[PDB]
Amino acid sequence: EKRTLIAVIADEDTTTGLLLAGIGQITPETQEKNFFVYQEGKTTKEEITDKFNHFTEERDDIAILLINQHIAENIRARVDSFTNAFPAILEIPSKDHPYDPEKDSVLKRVRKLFG
């Protein structure tokens, strides 16, 4: 399996926390930046959509894509339009936005079964 790297689409404080956790900024050999630092207001939807596509489609080594739930909600249409199970996407809490189960995809999918 080639997918071994962790990609992050997070804000500044979440990026600091994930770096402190030991997640790496670049690919160890290709030296390709697998972090995207989202800045509120200054970063438009097109940038984060492009980076989501980059970490999910063009990169064949990204195993996990950590994205802040408010960034994911910003592009929830694009995030839910993604169906491939190879890059595992997880929504993580942000500094000022706690994890909102309203926006959980798993809970809505369980809703779909009506039981």
Closest CB 99 distance from another protein, rounded Å: 5
SS3 label, residue 33: strand
Choice between 12 and 53, CB closer to another protein: 12
Comparing C-alpha atoms, which of 106, 100, 9, 108 is closest to residue 49?
9
Comparing C-alpha atoms, which of 58, 78, 59 is closest to residue 67?
78
Closest CB 11 distance from another protein, rounded Å: 9
Closest CB 65 distance from another protein, rounded Å: 10
List interacting residues with another protein (CB under 8 A): 1, 3-6, 12-13, 15-28, 31, 33, 37, 40-41, 63-64, 66, 85-86, 88, 90, 92-93, 95-96, 98-99, 101, 106, 109-110, 112-113, 115
> Which sign, positive or negative, has the C-alpha torsion 109, 5, 93, 77?
negative
